[PDB]
Coordinates of C-alpha atoms in Angstrom, one line a residue:
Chain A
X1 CA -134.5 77.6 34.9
X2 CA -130.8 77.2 35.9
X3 CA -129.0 76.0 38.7
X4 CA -125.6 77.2 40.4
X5 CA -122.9 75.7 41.2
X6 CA -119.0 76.4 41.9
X7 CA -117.3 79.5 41.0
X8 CA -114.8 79.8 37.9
X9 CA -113.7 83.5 37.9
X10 CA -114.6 87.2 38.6
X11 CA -114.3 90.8 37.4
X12 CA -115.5 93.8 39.7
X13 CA -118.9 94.0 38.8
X14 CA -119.7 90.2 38.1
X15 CA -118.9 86.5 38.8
X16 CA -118.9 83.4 36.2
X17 CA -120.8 80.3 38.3
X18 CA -120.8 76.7 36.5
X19 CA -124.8 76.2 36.3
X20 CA -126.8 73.2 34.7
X21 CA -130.0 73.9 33.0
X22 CA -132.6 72.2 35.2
X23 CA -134.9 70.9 32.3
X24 CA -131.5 70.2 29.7
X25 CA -129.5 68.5 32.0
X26 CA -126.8 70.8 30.2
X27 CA -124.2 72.7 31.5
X28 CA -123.1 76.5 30.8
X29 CA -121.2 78.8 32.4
X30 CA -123.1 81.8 34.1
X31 CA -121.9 85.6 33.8
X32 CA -123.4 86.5 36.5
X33 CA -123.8 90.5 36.7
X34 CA -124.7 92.9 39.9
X35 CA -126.7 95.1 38.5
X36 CA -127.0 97.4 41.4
X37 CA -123.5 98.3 41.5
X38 CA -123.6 99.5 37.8
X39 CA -124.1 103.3 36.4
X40 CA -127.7 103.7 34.3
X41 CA -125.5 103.8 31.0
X42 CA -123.3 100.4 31.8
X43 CA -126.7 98.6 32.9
X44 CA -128.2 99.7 29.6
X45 CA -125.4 98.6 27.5
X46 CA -125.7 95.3 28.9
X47 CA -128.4 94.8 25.9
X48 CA -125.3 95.6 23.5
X49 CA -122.9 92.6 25.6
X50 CA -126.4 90.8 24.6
X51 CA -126.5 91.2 20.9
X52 CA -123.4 90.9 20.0
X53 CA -122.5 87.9 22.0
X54 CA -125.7 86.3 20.2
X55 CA -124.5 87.6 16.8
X56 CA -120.7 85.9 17.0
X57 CA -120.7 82.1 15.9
X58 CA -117.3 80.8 15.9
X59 CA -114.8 78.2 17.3
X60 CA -112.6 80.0 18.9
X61 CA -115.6 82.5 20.2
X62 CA -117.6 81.6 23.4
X63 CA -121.1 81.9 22.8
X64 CA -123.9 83.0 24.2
X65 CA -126.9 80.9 25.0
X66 CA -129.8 82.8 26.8
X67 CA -130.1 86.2 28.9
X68 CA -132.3 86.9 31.8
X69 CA -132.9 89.9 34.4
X70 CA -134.0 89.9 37.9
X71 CA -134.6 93.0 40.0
X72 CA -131.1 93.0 41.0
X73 CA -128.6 90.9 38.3
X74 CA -128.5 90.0 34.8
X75 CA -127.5 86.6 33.6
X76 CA -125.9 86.3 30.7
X77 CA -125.4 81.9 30.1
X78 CA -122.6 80.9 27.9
X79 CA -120.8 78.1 26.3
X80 CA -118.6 76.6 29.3
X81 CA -115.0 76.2 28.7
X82 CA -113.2 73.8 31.1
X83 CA -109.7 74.7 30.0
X84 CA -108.9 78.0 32.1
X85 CA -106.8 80.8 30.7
X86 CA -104.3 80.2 28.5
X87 CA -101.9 82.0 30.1
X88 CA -101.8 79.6 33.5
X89 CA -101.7 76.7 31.1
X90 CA -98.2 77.6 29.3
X91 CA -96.4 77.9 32.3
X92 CA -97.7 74.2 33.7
X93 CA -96.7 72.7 30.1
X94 CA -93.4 70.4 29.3
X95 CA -92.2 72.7 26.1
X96 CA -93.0 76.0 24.9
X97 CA -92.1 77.5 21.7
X98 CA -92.2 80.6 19.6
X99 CA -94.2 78.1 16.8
X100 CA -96.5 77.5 20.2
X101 CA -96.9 81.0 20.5
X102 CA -97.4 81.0 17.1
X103 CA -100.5 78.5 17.1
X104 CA -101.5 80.8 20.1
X105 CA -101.9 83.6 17.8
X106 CA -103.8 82.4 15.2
X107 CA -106.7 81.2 16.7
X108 CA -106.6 84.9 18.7
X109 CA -106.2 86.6 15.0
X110 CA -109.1 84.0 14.0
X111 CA -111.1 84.9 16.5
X112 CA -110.7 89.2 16.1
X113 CA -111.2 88.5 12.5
X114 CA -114.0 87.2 12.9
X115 CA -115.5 90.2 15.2
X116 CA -114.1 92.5 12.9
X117 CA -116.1 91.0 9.9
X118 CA -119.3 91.4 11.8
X119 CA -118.6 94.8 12.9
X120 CA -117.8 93.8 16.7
X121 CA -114.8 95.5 18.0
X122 CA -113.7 94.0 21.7
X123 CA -111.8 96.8 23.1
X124 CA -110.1 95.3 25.6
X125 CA -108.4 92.5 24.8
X126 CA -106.1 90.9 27.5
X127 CA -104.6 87.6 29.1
X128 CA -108.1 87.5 31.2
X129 CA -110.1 86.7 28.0
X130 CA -107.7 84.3 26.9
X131 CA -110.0 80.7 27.9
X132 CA -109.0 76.8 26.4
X133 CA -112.0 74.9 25.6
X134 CA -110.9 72.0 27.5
X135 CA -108.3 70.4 29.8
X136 CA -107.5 68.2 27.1
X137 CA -104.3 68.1 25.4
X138 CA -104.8 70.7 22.1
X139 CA -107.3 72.4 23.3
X140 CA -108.7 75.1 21.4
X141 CA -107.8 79.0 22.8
X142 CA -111.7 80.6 22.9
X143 CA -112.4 84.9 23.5
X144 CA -114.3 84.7 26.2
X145 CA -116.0 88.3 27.6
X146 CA -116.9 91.1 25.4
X147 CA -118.6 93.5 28.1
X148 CA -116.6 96.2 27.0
X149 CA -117.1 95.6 22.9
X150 CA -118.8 97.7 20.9
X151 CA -120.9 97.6 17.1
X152 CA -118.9 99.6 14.7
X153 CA -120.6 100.7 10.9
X154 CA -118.4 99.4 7.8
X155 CA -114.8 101.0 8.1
X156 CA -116.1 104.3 10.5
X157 CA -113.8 105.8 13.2
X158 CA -115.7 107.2 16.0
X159 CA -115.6 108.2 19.9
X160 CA -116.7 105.7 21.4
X161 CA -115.5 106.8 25.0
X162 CA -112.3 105.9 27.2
X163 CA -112.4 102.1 27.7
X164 CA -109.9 99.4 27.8
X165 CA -106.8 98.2 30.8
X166 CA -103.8 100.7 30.9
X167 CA -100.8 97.9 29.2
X168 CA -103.0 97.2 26.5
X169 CA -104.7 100.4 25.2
X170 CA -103.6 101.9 21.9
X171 CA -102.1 105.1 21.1
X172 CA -105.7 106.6 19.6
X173 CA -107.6 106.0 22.4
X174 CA -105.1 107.8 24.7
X175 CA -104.7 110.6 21.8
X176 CA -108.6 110.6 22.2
X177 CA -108.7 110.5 18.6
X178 CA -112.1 108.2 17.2
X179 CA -111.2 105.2 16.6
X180 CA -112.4 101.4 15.4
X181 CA -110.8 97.9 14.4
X182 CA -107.2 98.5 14.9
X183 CA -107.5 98.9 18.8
X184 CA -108.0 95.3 18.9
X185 CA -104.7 94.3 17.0
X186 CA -102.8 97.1 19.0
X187 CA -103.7 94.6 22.2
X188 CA -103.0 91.7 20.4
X189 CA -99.1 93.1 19.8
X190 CA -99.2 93.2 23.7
X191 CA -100.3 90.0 23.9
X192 CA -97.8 88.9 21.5
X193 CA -95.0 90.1 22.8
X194 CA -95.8 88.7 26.2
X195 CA -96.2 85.2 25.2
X196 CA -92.7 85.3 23.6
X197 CA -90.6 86.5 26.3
X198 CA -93.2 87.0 29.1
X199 CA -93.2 90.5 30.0
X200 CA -95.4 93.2 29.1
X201 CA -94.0 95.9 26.3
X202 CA -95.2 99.1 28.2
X203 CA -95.3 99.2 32.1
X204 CA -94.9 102.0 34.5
X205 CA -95.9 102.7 38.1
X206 CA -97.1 106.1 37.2
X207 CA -100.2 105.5 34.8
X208 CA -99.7 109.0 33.6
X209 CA -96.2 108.0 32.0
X210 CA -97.0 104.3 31.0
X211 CA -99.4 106.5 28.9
X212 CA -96.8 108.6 27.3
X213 CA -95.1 105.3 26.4
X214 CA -97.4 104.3 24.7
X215 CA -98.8 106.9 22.9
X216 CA -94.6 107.4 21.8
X217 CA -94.6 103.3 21.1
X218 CA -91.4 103.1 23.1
X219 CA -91.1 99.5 23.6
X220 CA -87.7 97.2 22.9
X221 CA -86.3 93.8 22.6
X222 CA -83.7 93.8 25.1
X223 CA -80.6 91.0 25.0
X224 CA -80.6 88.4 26.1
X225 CA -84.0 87.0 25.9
X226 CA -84.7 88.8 22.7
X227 CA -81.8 87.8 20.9
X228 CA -82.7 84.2 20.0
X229 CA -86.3 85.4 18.9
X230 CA -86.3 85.2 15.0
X231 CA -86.3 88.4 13.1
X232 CA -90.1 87.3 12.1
X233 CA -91.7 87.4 15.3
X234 CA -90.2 91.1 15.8
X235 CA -91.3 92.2 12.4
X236 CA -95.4 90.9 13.2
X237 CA -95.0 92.5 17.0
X238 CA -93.8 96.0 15.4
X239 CA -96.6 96.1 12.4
X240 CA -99.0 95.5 15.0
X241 CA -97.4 97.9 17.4
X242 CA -97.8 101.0 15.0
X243 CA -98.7 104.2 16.6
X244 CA -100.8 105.0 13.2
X245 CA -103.5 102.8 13.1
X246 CA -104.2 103.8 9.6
X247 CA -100.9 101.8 8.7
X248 CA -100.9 99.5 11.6
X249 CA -101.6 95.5 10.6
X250 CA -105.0 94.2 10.4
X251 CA -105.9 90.8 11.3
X252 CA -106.9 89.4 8.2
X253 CA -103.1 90.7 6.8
X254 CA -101.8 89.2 10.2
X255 CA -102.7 86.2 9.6
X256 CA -100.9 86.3 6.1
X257 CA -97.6 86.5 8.0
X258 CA -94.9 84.8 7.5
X259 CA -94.6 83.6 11.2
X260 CA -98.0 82.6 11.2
X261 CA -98.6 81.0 8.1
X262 CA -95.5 79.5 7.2
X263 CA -95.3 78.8 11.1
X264 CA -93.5 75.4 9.9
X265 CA -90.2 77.1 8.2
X266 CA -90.3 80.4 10.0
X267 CA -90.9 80.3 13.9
X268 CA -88.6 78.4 16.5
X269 CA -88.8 75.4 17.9
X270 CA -86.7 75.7 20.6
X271 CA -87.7 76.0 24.5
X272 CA -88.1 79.2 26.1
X273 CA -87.9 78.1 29.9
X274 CA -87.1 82.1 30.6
X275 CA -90.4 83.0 29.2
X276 CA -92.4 80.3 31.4
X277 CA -90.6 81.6 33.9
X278 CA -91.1 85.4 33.6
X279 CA -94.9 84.4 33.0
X280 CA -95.2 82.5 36.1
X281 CA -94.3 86.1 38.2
X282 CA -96.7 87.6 35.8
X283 CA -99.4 85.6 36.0
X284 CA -98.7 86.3 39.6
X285 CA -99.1 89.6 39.8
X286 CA -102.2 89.9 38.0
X287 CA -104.4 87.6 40.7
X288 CA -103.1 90.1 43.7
X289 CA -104.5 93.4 41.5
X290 CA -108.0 94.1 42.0
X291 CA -109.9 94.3 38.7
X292 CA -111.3 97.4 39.8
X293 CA -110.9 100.6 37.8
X294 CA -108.5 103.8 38.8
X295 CA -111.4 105.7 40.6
X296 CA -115.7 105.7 40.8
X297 CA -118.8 107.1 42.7
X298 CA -119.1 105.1 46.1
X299 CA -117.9 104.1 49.5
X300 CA -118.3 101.0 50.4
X301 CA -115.8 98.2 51.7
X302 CA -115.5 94.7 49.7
X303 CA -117.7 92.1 51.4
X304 CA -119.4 88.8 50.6
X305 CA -118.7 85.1 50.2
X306 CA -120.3 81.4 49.8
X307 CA -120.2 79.4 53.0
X308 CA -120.6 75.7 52.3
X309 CA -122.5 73.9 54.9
X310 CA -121.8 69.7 56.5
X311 CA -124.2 67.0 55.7
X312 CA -125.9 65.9 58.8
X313 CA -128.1 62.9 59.7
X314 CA -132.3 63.3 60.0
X315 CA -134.4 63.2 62.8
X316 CA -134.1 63.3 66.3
X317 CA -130.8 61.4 67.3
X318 CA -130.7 62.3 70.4
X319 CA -132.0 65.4 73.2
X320 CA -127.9 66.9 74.4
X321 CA -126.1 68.7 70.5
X322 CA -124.4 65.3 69.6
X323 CA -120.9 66.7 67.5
X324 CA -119.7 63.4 65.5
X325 CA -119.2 61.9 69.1
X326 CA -118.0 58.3 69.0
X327 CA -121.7 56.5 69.0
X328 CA -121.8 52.7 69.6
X329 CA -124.5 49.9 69.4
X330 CA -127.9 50.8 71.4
X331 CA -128.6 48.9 74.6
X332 CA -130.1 45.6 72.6
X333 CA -128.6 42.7 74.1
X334 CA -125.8 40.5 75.2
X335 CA -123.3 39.2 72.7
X336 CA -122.9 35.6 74.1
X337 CA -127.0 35.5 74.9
X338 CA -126.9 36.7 70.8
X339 CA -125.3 32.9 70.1
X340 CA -127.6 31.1 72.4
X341 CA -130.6 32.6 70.3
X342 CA -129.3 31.9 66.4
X343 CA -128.1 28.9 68.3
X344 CA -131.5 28.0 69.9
X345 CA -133.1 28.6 66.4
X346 CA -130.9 26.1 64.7
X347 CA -131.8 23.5 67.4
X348 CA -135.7 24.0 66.5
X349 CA -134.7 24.5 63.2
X350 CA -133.4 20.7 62.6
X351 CA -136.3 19.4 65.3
X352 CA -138.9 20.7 62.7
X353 CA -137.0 19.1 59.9
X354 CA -137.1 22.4 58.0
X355 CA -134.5 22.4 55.7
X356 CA -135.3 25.6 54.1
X357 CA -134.4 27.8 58.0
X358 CA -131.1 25.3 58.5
X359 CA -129.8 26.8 55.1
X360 CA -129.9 29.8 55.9
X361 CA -127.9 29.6 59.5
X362 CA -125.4 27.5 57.8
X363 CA -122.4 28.6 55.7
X364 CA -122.9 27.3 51.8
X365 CA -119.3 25.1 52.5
X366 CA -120.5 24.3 55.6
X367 CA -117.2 22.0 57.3
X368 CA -119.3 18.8 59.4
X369 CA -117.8 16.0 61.3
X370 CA -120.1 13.4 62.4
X371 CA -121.1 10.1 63.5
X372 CA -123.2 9.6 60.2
X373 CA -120.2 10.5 58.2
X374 CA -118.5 7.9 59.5
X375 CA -114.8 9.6 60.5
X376 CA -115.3 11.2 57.1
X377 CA -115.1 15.5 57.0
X378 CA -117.8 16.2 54.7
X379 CA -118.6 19.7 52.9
X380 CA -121.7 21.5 52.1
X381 CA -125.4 20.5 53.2
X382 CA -126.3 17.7 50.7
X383 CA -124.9 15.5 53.4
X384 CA -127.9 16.7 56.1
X385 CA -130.9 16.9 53.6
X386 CA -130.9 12.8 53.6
X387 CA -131.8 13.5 57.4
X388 CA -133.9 16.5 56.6
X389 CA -135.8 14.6 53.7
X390 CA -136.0 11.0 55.5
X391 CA -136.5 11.1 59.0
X392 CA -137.1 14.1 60.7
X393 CA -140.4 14.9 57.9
X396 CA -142.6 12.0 63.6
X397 CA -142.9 11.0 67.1
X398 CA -142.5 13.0 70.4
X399 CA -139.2 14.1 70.6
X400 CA -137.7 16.3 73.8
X401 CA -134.1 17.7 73.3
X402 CA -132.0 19.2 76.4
X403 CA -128.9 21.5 76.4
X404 CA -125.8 21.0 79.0
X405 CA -123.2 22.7 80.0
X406 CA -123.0 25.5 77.1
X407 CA -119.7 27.3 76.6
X408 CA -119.5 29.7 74.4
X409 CA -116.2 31.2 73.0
X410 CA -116.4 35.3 71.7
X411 CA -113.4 35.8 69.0
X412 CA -114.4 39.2 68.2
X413 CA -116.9 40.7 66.7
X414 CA -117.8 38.6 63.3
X415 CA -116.6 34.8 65.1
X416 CA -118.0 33.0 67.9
X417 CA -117.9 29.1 69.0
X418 CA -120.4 27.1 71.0
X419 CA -119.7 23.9 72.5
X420 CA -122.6 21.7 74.6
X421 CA -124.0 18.5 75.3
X422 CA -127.0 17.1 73.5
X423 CA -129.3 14.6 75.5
X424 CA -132.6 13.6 73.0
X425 CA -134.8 11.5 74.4
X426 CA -136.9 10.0 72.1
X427 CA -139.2 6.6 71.3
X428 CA -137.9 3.1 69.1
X429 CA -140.5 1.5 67.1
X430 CA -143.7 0.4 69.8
X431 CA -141.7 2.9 73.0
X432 CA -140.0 2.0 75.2
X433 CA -138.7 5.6 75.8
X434 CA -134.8 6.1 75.2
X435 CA -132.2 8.9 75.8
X436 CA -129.2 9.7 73.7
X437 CA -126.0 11.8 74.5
X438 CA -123.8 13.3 71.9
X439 CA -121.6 16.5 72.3
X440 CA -121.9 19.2 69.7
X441 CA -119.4 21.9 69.0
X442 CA -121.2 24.8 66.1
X443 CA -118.2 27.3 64.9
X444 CA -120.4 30.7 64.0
X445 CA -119.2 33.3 61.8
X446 CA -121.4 36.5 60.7
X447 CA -121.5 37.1 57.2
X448 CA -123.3 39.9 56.5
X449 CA -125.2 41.2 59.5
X450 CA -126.1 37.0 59.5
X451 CA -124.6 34.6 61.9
X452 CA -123.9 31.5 60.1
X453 CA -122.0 28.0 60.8
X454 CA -118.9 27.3 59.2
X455 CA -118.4 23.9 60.9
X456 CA -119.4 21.8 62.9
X457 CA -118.6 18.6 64.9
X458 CA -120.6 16.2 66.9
X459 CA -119.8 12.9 68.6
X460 CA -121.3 9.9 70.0
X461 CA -124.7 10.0 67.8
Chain B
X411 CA -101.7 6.4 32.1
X412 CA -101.5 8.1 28.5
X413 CA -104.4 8.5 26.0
X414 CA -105.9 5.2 26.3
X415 CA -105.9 4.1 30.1
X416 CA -107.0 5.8 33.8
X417 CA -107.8 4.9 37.2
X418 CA -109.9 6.5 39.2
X419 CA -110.3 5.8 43.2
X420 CA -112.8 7.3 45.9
X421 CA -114.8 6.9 48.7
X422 CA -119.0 6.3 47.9
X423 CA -121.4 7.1 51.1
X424 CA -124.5 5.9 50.4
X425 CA -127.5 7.0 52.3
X426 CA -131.0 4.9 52.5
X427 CA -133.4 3.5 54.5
X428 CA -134.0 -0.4 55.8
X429 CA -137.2 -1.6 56.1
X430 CA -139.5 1.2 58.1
X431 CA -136.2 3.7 58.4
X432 CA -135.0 4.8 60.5
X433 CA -132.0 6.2 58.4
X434 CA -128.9 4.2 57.6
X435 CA -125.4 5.6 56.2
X436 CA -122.7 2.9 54.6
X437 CA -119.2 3.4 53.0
X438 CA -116.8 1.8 50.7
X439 CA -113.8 2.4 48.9
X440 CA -113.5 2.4 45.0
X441 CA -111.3 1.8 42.6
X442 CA -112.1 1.8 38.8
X443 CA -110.1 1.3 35.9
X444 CA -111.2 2.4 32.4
X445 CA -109.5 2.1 29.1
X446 CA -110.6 4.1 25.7
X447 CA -111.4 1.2 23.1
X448 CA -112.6 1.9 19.9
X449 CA -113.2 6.0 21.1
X450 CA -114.8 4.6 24.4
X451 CA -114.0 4.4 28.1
X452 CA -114.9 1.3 29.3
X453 CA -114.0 -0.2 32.8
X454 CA -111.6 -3.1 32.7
X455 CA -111.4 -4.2 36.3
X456 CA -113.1 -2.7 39.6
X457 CA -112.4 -3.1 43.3
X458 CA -114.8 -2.5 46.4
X459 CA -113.9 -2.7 49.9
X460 CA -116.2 -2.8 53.4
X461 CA -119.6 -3.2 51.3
Chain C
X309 CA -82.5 62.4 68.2
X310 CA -84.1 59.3 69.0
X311 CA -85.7 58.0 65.5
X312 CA -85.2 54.6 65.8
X313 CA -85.8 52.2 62.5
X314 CA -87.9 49.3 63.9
X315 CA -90.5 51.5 65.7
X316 CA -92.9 49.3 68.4
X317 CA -96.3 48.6 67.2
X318 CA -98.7 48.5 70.2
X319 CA -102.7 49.2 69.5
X320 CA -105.9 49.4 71.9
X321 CA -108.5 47.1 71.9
X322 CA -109.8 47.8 68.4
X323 CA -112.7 46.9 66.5
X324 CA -111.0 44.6 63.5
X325 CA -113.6 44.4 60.7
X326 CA -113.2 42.6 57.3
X327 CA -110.0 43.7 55.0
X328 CA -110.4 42.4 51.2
X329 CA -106.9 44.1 49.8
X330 CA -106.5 43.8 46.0
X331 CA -102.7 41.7 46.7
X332 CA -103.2 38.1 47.7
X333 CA -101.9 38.2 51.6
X334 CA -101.3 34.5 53.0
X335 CA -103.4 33.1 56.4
X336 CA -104.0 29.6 55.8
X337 CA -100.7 28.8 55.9
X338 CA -99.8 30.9 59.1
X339 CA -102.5 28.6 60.2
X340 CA -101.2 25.6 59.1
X341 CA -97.4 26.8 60.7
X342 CA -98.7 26.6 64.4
X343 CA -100.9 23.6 64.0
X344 CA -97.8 21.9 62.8
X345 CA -95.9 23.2 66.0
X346 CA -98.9 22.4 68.2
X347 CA -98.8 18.8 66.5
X348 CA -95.1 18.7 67.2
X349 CA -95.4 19.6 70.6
X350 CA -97.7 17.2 71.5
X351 CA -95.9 14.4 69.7
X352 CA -92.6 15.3 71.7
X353 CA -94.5 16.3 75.0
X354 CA -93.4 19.8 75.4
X355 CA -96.4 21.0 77.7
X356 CA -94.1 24.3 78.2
X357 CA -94.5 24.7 74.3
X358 CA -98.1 23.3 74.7
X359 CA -99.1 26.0 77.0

């Protein structure tokens, strides 16, 4: 059904493949899922990824196309985005903003509110799900990957399990406490407060204490960089970084907020190169760690790649392996013996009086000097076809070549010069003889030797 | 020479045959002098050499 | 070191085939330059320059 092409990103447990849909002719990206290398339970909640990637129709929400299993993978085809993450973008652009971060944002909040209206909670948020829709300027910021979300009923808390990545999981989950909606906007506080001074709110060496920070919401806005944020910003960051999530933000009154929707009047305009430059390092860091999780059941070192292969010509070339080695022509003939034979041809070629053969061997500006022309240069073969027409469409004519020179000026150019002797028959014969000496100036156009001039004397 | 006047001059070859031909080749030089009258180029004067 | 400006510029025999460059690169007149010296040493007979 499909076909796959390059690589555009990974996770532990799957790949995404650019693939074209063989009877479309459309193109999708591929989640691409190893389903030997999951537990019974994640394999099975791959039909939950299914259904509620079909269920969510939005624009900032990649979709989901089709789903397929094989005896080892799942594919799981979606919308492809072109764009990459949003987070590698910011740091290639000219300006950045807080009212960029702010635009940032609100699709995000768009985008969760639009999960959380049909009961979809995505659990684990984070710079990695963070897509543009294109490489063109404005592109749209699109949630892409909800393998770890999860179908919620109306406004219920419950225990889900213990899901998420350590910097962005919220106090409730940590508190094992049941949970729902707000988890989401916790992350999104995270994610807020790294695209405004690029640096994560909560990070520790010790997983065990980053915890504890957490679960205390003992984050800050150090000076410098903090101190030319507005007051705005701060105040969205801390209602969305509330340790209750009974009074933390939701993203429907998030996107009420001042700094959101009066963006215009509210958030700065002014360049943050510190932040660009923080999220470089950032960004950074993230591509060295693994995605894989704290600990699982298995032993076995990471292994596997694509090898391309090299085009390489049909047939049988030749017996000894041949390696790109400098080949040359085949053992056909002799370059000068080459002009004798076009050469011969044009002789016979003008004996028949066919016209139609002498165009062809001659140059469409063909340069003449002759006899006929009377000390005139003349262009072209209009001059020739009076000849061609006239006389030469009968009587017993031998013509004999002397002394032939011929001049090799590299590969494409080559000049001939000889004596002509014709002998011939006037009127009731009475055989005669002529002499005139020929010089033909042969260029190949083309794979096609043909005369650019020519000059002939004593005719 | 303005709107109204020109001169043109050349060289005519002029291929034919004489009696059974055997092919025969001839030049001459030409000059030619038109003048527009009346929205009209019509030659004035004319002058042929070696014909 | 020895990085001199006007480097030497010395090839094998090469194969030279057509080179159709968008810019217009002059030839006929190069051509046209040493026909006009070959001209000029004929008229002054300058075999030297001839040969």
């Amino acid at each position: 059904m499909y076909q796959l092409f390059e690589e555009l990103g990974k996770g532990a447990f799957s790949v995404v493949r650019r693939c074209v849909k063989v009877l479309a002719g459309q193109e999708y990206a591929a989640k691409i899922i190893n389903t030997k290398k999951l537990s019974a339970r994640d394999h099975q909640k791959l039909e939950r990824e299914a259904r509620i990637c079909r269920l969510l129709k939005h624009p900032n929400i990649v979709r989901l196309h089709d789903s397929i299993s094989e005896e080892g993978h799942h594919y799981l085809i979606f919308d492809l985005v072109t764009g990459g993450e949003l987070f590698e973008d910011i740091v290639a652009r000219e300006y950045y903003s807080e009212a960029d971060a702010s635009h940032c944002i609100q699709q995000i909040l768009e985008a969760v509110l639009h999960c959380h209206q049909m009961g979809v909670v995505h659990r684990d948020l984070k710079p990695e799900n963070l897509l543009l829709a294109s490489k063109l300027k404005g592109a749209a910021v699109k949630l892409a990957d909800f393998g770890l979300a999860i179908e919620v009923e109306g406004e219920q808390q419950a225990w889900f399990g213990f899901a998420g990545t350590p910097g962005y999981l919220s106090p409730e989950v940590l508190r094992k406490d049941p949970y729902g909606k707000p988890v989401d906007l916790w992350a999104c506080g995270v994610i807020l407060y790294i695209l405004l001074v690029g640096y994560p709110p909560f990070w520790d060496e010790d997983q065990h204490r980053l915890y504890q920070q957490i679960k205390a919401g003992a984050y800050d806005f150090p000076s410098p960089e903090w101190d030319t944020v507005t007051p705005e910003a701060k105040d969205l960051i801390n209602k969305m970084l509330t340790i209750n999530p009974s009074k933390r933000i939701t993203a429907a009154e998030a996107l009420k907020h001042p700094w959101i929707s009066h963006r215009s009047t509210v958030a700065s305009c002014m360049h943050r190169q510190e932040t660009v430059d923080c999220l470089k390092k950032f960004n950074a860091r993230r591509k060295l760690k693994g995605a894989i999780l704290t600990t699982m059941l298995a032993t076995r070192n990471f292994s596997g790649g694509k090898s391309g292969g090299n085009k390489k010509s049909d047939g049988v070339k030749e017996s000894s392996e041949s390696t790109n080695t400098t080949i040359e022509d085949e053992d056909t003939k002799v370059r000068k013996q080459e002009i004798i034979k076009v050469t011969e041809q044009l002789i016979e070629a003008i004996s028949n009086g066919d016209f139609e053969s002498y165009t062809k061997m001659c140059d469409p500006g063909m340069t003449a000097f002759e006899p006929e022309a009377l000390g005139n240069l003349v262009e072209g073969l209009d001059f020739h076809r009076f000849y061609f027409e006239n006389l030469w469409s009968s009587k017993p004519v031998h013509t004999t070549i002397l002394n032939p020179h011929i001049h090799l000026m590299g590969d494409e150019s080559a000049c001939i010069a000889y004596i002509r002797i014709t002998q011939y028959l006037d009127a009731g014969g009475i055989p005669r003889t002529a002499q005139s000496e020929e010089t033909r100036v042969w260029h190949r156009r083309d794979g096609k030797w043909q005369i650019v001039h020519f000059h002939r004397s004593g005719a």
